[PDB]
Write a protein that holds these residues in place. Structure first.
Motif, PDB file in Angstrom:
ATOM      1  N   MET A   7       0.923  -1.239  -0.066  1.00  0.00           N
ATOM      2  CA  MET A   7       0.043  -0.006  -0.032  1.00  0.00           C
ATOM      3  C   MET A   7       0.837   1.319  -0.199  1.00  0.00           C
ATOM      4  O   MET A   7       1.533   1.593   0.941  1.00  0.00           O
ATOM      5  N   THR A   8       0.961   1.872  -1.095  1.00  0.00           N
ATOM      6  CA  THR A   8       1.888   3.273  -1.314  1.00  0.00           C
ATOM      7  C   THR A   8       0.886   4.549  -1.193  1.00  0.00           C
ATOM      8  O   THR A   8       0.087   4.782  -1.810  1.00  0.00           O
ATOM      9  N   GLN A   9       1.413   4.989   0.032  1.00  0.00           N
ATOM     10  CA  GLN A   9       0.692   6.292   0.262  1.00  0.00           C
ATOM     11  C   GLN A   9       1.486   7.621  -0.111  1.00  0.00           C
ATOM     12  O   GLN A   9       2.689   7.592   0.139  1.00  0.00           O
ATOM     13  N   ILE A  10       0.550   8.522  -0.876  1.00  0.00           N
ATOM     14  CA  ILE A  10       1.344   9.866  -1.189  1.00  0.00           C
ATOM     15  C   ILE A  10       0.528  10.900  -0.720  1.00  0.00           C
ATOM     16  O   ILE A  10      -0.938  10.878  -0.864  1.00  0.00           O
ATOM     17  N   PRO A  11       1.064  12.174  -0.042  1.00  0.00           N
ATOM     18  CA  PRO A  11       2.445  12.114   0.370  1.00  0.00           C
ATOM     19  C   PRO A  11       2.770  11.464   1.673  1.00  0.00           C
ATOM     20  O   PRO A  11       1.564  11.103   2.043  1.00  0.00           O
ATOM     21  N   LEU A  12       3.810  11.610   2.148  1.00  0.00           N
ATOM     22  CA  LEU A  12       4.080  11.297   3.555  1.00  0.00           C
ATOM     23  C   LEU A  12       4.012  12.426   4.628  1.00  0.00           C
ATOM     24  O   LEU A  12       3.468  11.960   5.774  1.00  0.00           O
ATOM     25  N   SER A  13       4.165  13.465   4.154  1.00  0.00           N
ATOM     26  CA  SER A  13       3.532  14.893   4.925  1.00  0.00           C
ATOM     27  C   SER A  13       3.032  15.653   3.995  1.00  0.00           C
ATOM     28  O   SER A  13       3.429  15.874   3.179  1.00  0.00           O
ATOM     29  N   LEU A  14       1.987  16.307   4.595  1.00  0.00           N
ATOM     30  CA  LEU A  14       1.115  17.543   3.729  1.00  0.00           C
ATOM     31  C   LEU A  14       0.719  18.542   4.608  1.00  0.00           C
ATOM     32  O   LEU A  14      -0.321  18.265   5.597  1.00  0.00           O
ATOM     33  N   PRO A  15       1.233  19.555   4.406  1.00  0.00           N
ATOM     34  CA  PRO A  15       1.022  20.957   5.075  1.00  0.00           C
ATOM     35  C   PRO A  15      -0.329  21.663   4.478  1.00  0.00           C
ATOM     36  O   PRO A  15      -0.504  21.780   3.135  1.00  0.00           O
ATOM     37  N   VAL A  16      -1.351  22.018   5.079  1.00  0.00           N
ATOM     38  CA  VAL A  16      -2.708  22.633   4.661  1.00  0.00           C
ATOM     39  C   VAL A  16      -3.122  23.779   5.300  1.00  0.00           C
ATOM     40  O   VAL A  16      -2.960  23.682   6.504  1.00  0.00           O
ATOM     41  N   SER A  17      -3.620  24.777   4.633  1.00  0.00           N
ATOM     42  CA  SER A  17      -4.118  25.849   5.459  1.00  0.00           C
ATOM     43  C   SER A  17      -5.684  25.555   5.850  1.00  0.00           C
ATOM     44  O   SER A  17      -6.183  24.614   5.325  1.00  0.00           O
ATOM     45  N   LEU A  18      -6.129  26.010   7.119  1.00  0.00           N
ATOM     46  CA  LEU A  18      -7.496  25.791   7.525  1.00  0.00           C
ATOM     47  C   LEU A  18      -8.482  26.002   6.325  1.00  0.00           C
ATOM     48  O   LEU A  18      -8.155  27.341   5.856  1.00  0.00           O
ATOM     49  N   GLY A  19      -9.339  25.340   6.176  1.00  0.00           N
ATOM     50  CA  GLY A  19     -10.374  25.858   5.244  1.00  0.00           C
ATOM     51  C   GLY A  19     -10.285  25.328   3.953  1.00  0.00           C
ATOM     52  O   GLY A  19     -11.261  25.197   3.004  1.00  0.00           O
ATOM     53  N   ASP A  20      -8.946  24.788   3.469  1.00  0.00           N
ATOM     54  CA  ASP A  20      -8.745  24.113   2.305  1.00  0.00           C
ATOM     55  C   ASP A  20      -8.932  22.710   2.156  1.00  0.00           C
ATOM     56  O   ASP A  20      -9.206  22.182   3.050  1.00  0.00           O
ATOM     57  N   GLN A  21      -8.947  22.201   1.195  1.00  0.00           N
ATOM     58  CA  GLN A  21      -9.211  20.870   0.843  1.00  0.00           C
ATOM     59  C   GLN A  21      -7.607  20.200   0.727  1.00  0.00           C
ATOM     60  O   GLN A  21      -6.846  20.664   0.074  1.00  0.00           O
ATOM     61  N   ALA A  22      -7.721  18.911   1.581  1.00  0.00           N
ATOM     62  CA  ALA A  22      -6.640  17.969   1.527  1.00  0.00           C
ATOM     63  C   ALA A  22      -6.975  16.773   0.703  1.00  0.00           C
ATOM     64  O   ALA A  22      -7.958  16.289   0.691  1.00  0.00           O
ATOM     65  N   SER A  23      -5.963  16.378  -0.209  1.00  0.00           N
ATOM     66  CA  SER A  23      -6.154  15.006  -0.756  1.00  0.00           C
ATOM     67  C   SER A  23      -4.982  13.882  -0.456  1.00  0.00           C
ATOM     68  O   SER A  23      -3.779  14.513  -0.640  1.00  0.00           O
ATOM     69  N   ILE A  24      -5.272  12.754  -0.177  1.00  0.00           N
ATOM     70  CA  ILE A  24      -4.257  11.863   0.154  1.00  0.00           C
ATOM     71  C   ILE A  24      -4.645  10.623  -0.753  1.00  0.00           C
ATOM     72  O   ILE A  24      -5.742  10.227  -0.815  1.00  0.00           O
ATOM     73  N   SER A  25      -3.571  10.017  -1.436  1.00  0.00           N
ATOM     74  CA  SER A  25      -3.822   8.969  -2.321  1.00  0.00           C
ATOM     75  C   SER A  25      -2.933   7.592  -1.736  1.00  0.00           C
ATOM     76  O   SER A  25      -2.037   7.781  -0.945  1.00  0.00           O
ATOM     77  N   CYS A  26      -3.411   6.400  -2.142  1.00  0.00           N
ATOM     78  CA  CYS A  26      -3.148   5.345  -1.662  1.00  0.00           C
ATOM     79  C   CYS A  26      -3.262   4.348  -2.875  1.00  0.00           C
ATOM     80  O   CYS A  26      -4.302   4.275  -3.364  1.00  0.00           O
ATOM     81  N   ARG A  27      -2.201   3.644  -3.288  1.00  0.00           N
ATOM     82  CA  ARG A  27      -2.109   2.881  -4.310  1.00  0.00           C
ATOM     83  C   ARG A  27      -1.633   1.324  -3.771  1.00  0.00           C
ATOM     84  O   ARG A  27      -0.741   1.114  -3.198  1.00  0.00           O
ATOM     85  N   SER A  28      -2.423   0.310  -4.439  1.00  0.00           N
ATOM     86  CA  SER A  28      -2.245  -1.147  -3.938  1.00  0.00           C
ATOM     87  C   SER A  28      -1.590  -1.617  -5.196  1.00  0.00           C
ATOM     88  O   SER A  28      -1.514  -1.213  -5.991  1.00  0.00           O
ATOM     89  N   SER A  29      -0.567  -2.447  -4.752  1.00  0.00           N
ATOM     90  CA  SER A  29       0.324  -3.061  -5.565  1.00  0.00           C
ATOM     91  C   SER A  29      -0.636  -4.108  -6.689  1.00  0.00           C
ATOM     92  O   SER A  29       0.158  -4.654  -7.556  1.00  0.00           O
ATOM     93  N   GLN A  30      -1.556  -4.468  -6.109  1.00  0.00           N
ATOM     94  CA  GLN A  30      -2.690  -5.537  -6.741  1.00  0.00           C
ATOM     95  C   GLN A  30      -3.933  -5.267  -6.396  1.00  0.00           C
ATOM     96  O   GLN A  30      -4.145  -4.474  -5.442  1.00  0.00           O
ATOM     97  N   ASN A  31      -4.898  -6.031  -7.005  1.00  0.00           N
ATOM     98  CA  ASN A  31      -6.517  -5.689  -6.704  1.00  0.00           C
ATOM     99  C   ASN A  31      -6.739  -6.088  -5.219  1.00  0.00           C
ATOM    100  O   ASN A  31      -5.935  -7.037  -4.949  1.00  0.00           O
ATOM    101  N   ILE A  32      -7.663  -5.329  -4.649  1.00  0.00           N
ATOM    102  CA  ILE A  32      -7.964  -5.694  -3.090  1.00  0.00           C
ATOM    103  C   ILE A  32      -9.314  -6.118  -3.180  1.00  0.00           C
ATOM    104  O   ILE A  32     -10.051  -5.631  -2.018  1.00  0.00           O
ATOM    105  N   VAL A  33      -9.961  -6.671  -4.122  1.00  0.00           N
ATOM    106  CA  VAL A  33     -11.256  -7.308  -3.763  1.00  0.00           C
ATOM    107  C   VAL A  33     -11.287  -8.607  -3.316  1.00  0.00           C
ATOM    108  O   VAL A  33     -10.623  -9.472  -3.792  1.00  0.00           O
ATOM    109  N   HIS A  34     -11.819  -8.480  -2.108  1.00  0.00           N
ATOM    110  CA  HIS A  34     -11.957  -9.899  -1.306  1.00  0.00           C
ATOM    111  C   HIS A  34     -12.757 -10.799  -2.037  1.00  0.00           C
ATOM    112  O   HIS A  34     -13.961 -10.688  -2.918  1.00  0.00           O
ATOM    113  N   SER A  35     -12.379 -12.182  -1.928  1.00  0.00           N
ATOM    114  CA  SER A  35     -13.167 -12.989  -2.468  1.00  0.00           C
ATOM    115  C   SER A  35     -14.777 -13.191  -2.154  1.00  0.00           C
ATOM    116  O   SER A  35     -15.365 -13.795  -2.886  1.00  0.00           O
TER     117      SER A  35
END
Lengths: 11, 216, 216
Positions: free
Chosen positions: B4-32
């Motif tokens: 599970m690769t998360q981007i970024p590692l640290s993220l400064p944001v002003s109050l009131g702004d939107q923050a966005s955080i990404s997470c990429r899996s190295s393969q599909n994560i649909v359970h059986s």
């Protein structure tokens, strides 16, 4: 009885 | 294993702004069983993680509307609209679909805010400590921004680098400030030999240091 | 009243083992999975494994297969994790977490977390802290100095948790094989010393709690 496990086993 | 690769590692944001955080899996994560077990957790300083979002996009009970999760396949995203001071901490994505279950590396959300001067307070050794034969002088530099600050100790006008231990808090969850503690530790013998103890702080908010002192 | 109670700390020696307990209350222990999660200081989260407490089925991260052993005691509603052949790399916070009601697949997630056990692998002995009051405008700052303890952690509250605003508790610093930390609290100047202020320090490794009233 039988329980479907989180890892896909049936325990 | 699923990375599970998360981007970024640290993220400064002003109050009131939107923050966005990404997470990429190295393969599909649909359970059986058909579900995609993708969760977002928030861990605030000193606390256990707490659930925010489950099954990619479902808000957990009690979580505000401004947190939303989305994505599919191997790319997932957490968006925090209108960021608040209380949103501070480390966000982790997690996949619960393929053993071994795995967490992302975490994204530390940091808050930008207006500059603030430190409130400085100096404290002499307690009578209890003196009875035990030690002498610690404590100086708190509280609720300042940004995090960089300098502290110096002087005994009868003379600087003392030796014997000083310093500690910084994590960013405050209410006002997004930082604080720092500085402790000068001496023998009771050396403490008793001198009468004037000074803690002064240099911060970006002012050209002149803030100075606090007492006489033994 | 759903909770998972873990001891605050375990000190154990290198090359030994330690048993961590996770006591479930307020729900039917045998209807939900208990998982264990490792958190190294400053670092992310690592899933160790889970147990089904109704039938003792265990799923392990293969990385921990010869490090962790999971068990569950139905009569006491307690889950256990043994860590064997301890090394300094096993020093960490370990959480247990409730991770899914068996029969509703949509709620397989970590909804309830234990408060975490800080495991310290060391041959040193336990030393409880000395606690010193820090006593001395619109506001007044008070503090407690928590000196000379081992191992981590200590937890500090004020007035048994009822005084939470204006509190800064600073990370401990290690000096001469012992830890020291401080905590400050800022209250309205009219209020103290009229309305008493006490710092409560817990050191779970020595099973000790100290309450120190701050006096002018």
């Amino acid at each position: 009885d039988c329980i479907l496990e989180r890892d896909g086993s049936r325990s | 294993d699923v990375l599970m690769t998360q981007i970024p590692l640290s993220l400064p944001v002003s109050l009131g702004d939107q923050a966005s955080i990404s997470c990429r899996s190295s393969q599909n994560i649909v359970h059986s069983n058909g579900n995609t077990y993708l969760e977002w957790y928030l861990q605030k300083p000193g606390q256990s993680p707490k659930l925010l979002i489950y099954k990619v996009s479902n808000r957990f009970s009690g979580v505000p509307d401004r947190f939303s999760g989305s994505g599919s396949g191997t790319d997932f995203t957490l968006k925090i609209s209108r960021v608040e001071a209380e949103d501070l901490g480390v966000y982790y994505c997690f996949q619960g679909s393929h053993v071994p279950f795995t967490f992302g590396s975490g994204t530390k959300l940091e808050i930008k805010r207006a500059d603030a001067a430190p409130t400085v307070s100096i404290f002499p050794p307690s009578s209890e400590q003196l009875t035990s034969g030690g002498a610690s002088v404590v100086c708190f530099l509280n609720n300042f921004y940004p995090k960089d600050i300098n502290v110096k100790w002087k005994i009868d006008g003379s600087e003392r680098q030796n014997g000083v231990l310093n500690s910084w808090t994590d960013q405050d969850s209410k006002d997004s400030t930082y604080s720092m503690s500085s402790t000068l530790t001496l023998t009771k013998d050396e403490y008793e030999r001198h009468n004037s103890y000074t803690c002064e702080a240099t911060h970006k908010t002012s050209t002149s240091p803030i100075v606090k002192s007492f006489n033994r | 009243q759903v909770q998972l109670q873990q001891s605050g700390a375990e000190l154990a020696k290198p090359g030994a083992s330690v048993n961590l307990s996770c006591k479930a209350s307020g729900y039917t222990f045998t209807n939900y999975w208990v998982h264990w999660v490792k958190q190294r200081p400053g670092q992310g989260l690592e899933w160790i494994g889970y147990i089904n407490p109704s039938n003792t089925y265990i799923s392990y991260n293969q990385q921990f297969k010869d490090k962790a052993t999971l068990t569950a005691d139905k009569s006491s509603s307690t889950a256990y994790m043994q860590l064997s052949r301890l090394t300094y790399e096993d020093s960490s916070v370990y959480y247990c977490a409730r991770g899914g009601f068996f029969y509703d697949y949509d709620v397989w997630y970590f909804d309830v977390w234990g408060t975490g056990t800080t495991v310290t692998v060391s041959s040193a002995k336990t030393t409880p802290p000395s606690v010193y009051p820090l006593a001395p405008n619109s506001m007044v700052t008070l503090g407690c100095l928590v000196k000379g303890y081992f191992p981590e952690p200590v937890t500090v509250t004020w007035n048994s948790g009822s005084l939470s605003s204006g509190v800064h508790t600073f990370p401990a610093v290690l000096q001469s094989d012992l830890y020291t930390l401080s905590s400050s609290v800022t209250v309205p100047s009219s209020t103290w010393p009229s309305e008493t202020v006490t710092c409560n320090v817990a050191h779970p490794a020595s099973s000790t709690k100290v309450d120190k009233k701050i006096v002018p």
